[PDB]
Ligand SMILES: N#Cc1ccc(Cn2cncc2CN2CCN(c3cccc(Cl)c3)C(=O)C2)cc1
Ligand SMILES: CC(C)=CCC/C(C)=C/CC/C(C)=C/COP(=O)(O)OP(=O)(O)O
């Protein structure tokens with residue numbers, strides 16, 4: 154009907170159709186703390202929301218009122234909950250409500266309540282047909298919106314919409330290879346579909362990641378994904394990887410590469426590698442280089458790694 | 469060494485310039501934003517250096533105190549967006565005043581207690597304001613605020629019987645908790661529940677059944693913890709996850725090695741502060757959410773008898789974090805913030821100060837080692853890494869409530 158900013162908007166205390174119900178002012182106590190000096194419009198809407206909530210009035214007027222309360226404070230979870238109670242009682246058209254939540258999220262995508270409301274609607278309708286496209290639009294505006302990605306994972310997993318997600322991940326990585334949210338989605342997609350136990354899949358992933366690292370050597374996300382897909386089996390289980398990284402070292406001694414080498418050495422020592430003393434010396438030299446020169450912000454961590462290595466493998 | 473009036477800074481060393489972003493000549497939105505922030509931060513760093521003269525950094529206590537004191541009573545309509553988070557405003561402000569060692573007048577303490585009583589729901593828990601449904605976030609905030617006040621008047625406001633029933637009403641069979649009735653679930657709920665339950669002594673054997681395992685499922689390939697299983701690691705959710713596990717004495721459920729490497733990697737080599745997730749920007753509030761994980765990891769590893777743990781420092785750059793907060797996160801008018809260019813708010817004031825305190829104080833067993841950068845008056849009161857309220861407040865509250873029985877349970 155009329156929005157809060159509409160020229161013809163009328164305060165609830167002035168609406169004839171609301172005259173039969175008394176507004177309920179907020180009880181802040183005689184000596185209030187953290188007292189918000191509300192605008193007249195804000196207080197007016199909330200005084201009436203408090204009244205309908207208190208009377209548990211499941212009406213169309215109460216339903217429209219929640220829309221105004223939400224515009225005033227979309228983080229008010231009590232209003233959202235009551236709105237859902239009304240959606241059910243009044244048997245409101247859920248597709249119409251989906252259109253509403255779509256507009257709301259577009260305006261305020263960084264809010265927990267709006268995304269939760271949308272999830273409830275999709276669950277109620279058992280209809281995910283608009284989800285991937287809607288989410289892609291939000292991500293088109295902020296490619297790292299946490300709520301958007303979380304909602305995306307839920308929809309895909311709940312309705313088994315895995316088919317085109319790796320392509321979506323690939324497109325977004327092409328747009329910004331440093332987008333950590335996308336590398337996370339890549340892991341989410343693969344672990345839930347083919348898994349990483351398939352050696353052909355793992356090889357494809359290791360090659361792809363190494364390629365990305367060569368393109369942008371200082372992009373930490375690619376380095377983290379490489380370790381992430383190999384860490385559970387153990388970094389020392391991939392002998393060729395060590396050699397490849399070693400060749401790259403002179404021309405690409407980034408703290409990421411050096412740190413990865415220490416991680417490999419750590420695992421080697423943990424697995425009764427041959428040349429223990431040699432590997433330990435190499436690992437300690439690298440920890441020193443990282444602590445003193447290449448990654449000084451993490452000097453306390455690297456010094457701790459050096460002491461751990463000695464407590465576990467000095468013999 | 470140096471005269472007492474000049475104190476060399478890590479961020480001002482000539483080698484520090486080497487820490488600027490290397491974009492490999494491949495620009496993307498991420499590198500462009502990072503470079504913009506680094507450019508601004510360098511300007512700020514340079515303004516604190518006068519060739520070989522580097523005056524001691526100063527925490528503007530009095531200005532922060534006046535901003536906080538004013539906020540505790542009244543707020544502009546710019547705060548209408550936090551009308552469903554009023555107990556948070558109480559907690560953020562009280563905790564900041566507590567860190568600054570500014571006493572709470574009895575009148576103010578009583579008024580806060582009365583207000584929080586009005587926010588408490590008859591079904592248990594606290595809502596965002598009077599008459600609002602209860603929600604775990606403001607419940608966590610209200611309980612912490614009451615514990616900061618620490619009077620019997622404050623402790624007694626909590627309806628423990630209903631609080632426990634309320635927690636049960638949110639508990640899911642997979643071990644997770646809803647944030648509120650008909651609400652969303654994420655790691656924040658588990659921490660909010662574990663925090664209030666342990667402080668008020670209402671933990672039953674079944675309350676947290678499966679919770680430790682659900683939290684472990686949230687730890688991802690990165691080593692950090694996401695909001696729910698499968699999601700990207702974030703400092704906010706990682707703090708919640710690890711702190712909850714520490715309360716439950718189930719830290720070992722996590723791969724502490726990958727968590728440790730992940731959190732330490734979140735400290736920005738150039739800025740000195742912490743980012744919330746990989747490839748995102750530095751932000752003063754992460755001084756708490758991220759850096760706070762180090763005292764938790766230390767405690768955890770120490771419990772396992774790790775012989776390589778330091779006996780004097782947390783495993784992050786304590787000095788650099790203090791430099792970032794003191795030089796880049798203070799609003800000249802009082803209050804602290806995300807990064808230069810942003811406006812002050814109570815949330816950032818709370819967390820920037822909480823992080824500053826963690827960076828200043830190391831304690832493990834009988835070992836205590838302080839690193840207070842700048843003038844000596846910068847030293848803040850210590851904060852408990854699990855609850856983020858004074859350790860004295862934690863002991864006093866737990867001692868008080870341990871004298872009461874777990875509601876309807878033996
Ligand atoms: N929750 C949360 C949350 C979400 C996003 C962020 C990301 N973030 C980092 N710096 C500023 C922010 C954005 N925050 C400010 C605090 N806040 C909030 C409101 C009520 C209570 C609490 Cl603790 C926090 C929010 O909802 C949004 C931080 C925290
Ligand atoms: C007890 C309790 C309520 C704890 C809350 C902890 C916390 C800070 C959670 C963060 C959640 C989140 C969605 C961050 C992303 O916001 P963003 O994209 O705006 O920030 P970013 O760029 O720094 O990731």
Ligand SMILES: OC[C@H]1O[C@@](CO)(O[C@H]2O[C@H](CO)[C@@H](O)[C@H](O)[C@H]2O)[C@@H](O)[C@@H]1O
Pocket residue numbers: 344381382384385684685686687688689690691692721722723726727
């Ligand atoms: O940080 C990796 C570490 O986390 C655990 C959970 O504690 O598993 C996470 O990471 C795996 C990838 O390494 C994922 O397969 C798993 O789903 C995720 O929970 C540990 O098993 C692992 O060592």
Ligand SMILES: [Zn+2]
Pocket residue numbers: 751752753754806816
């Ligand atoms: Zn912040």
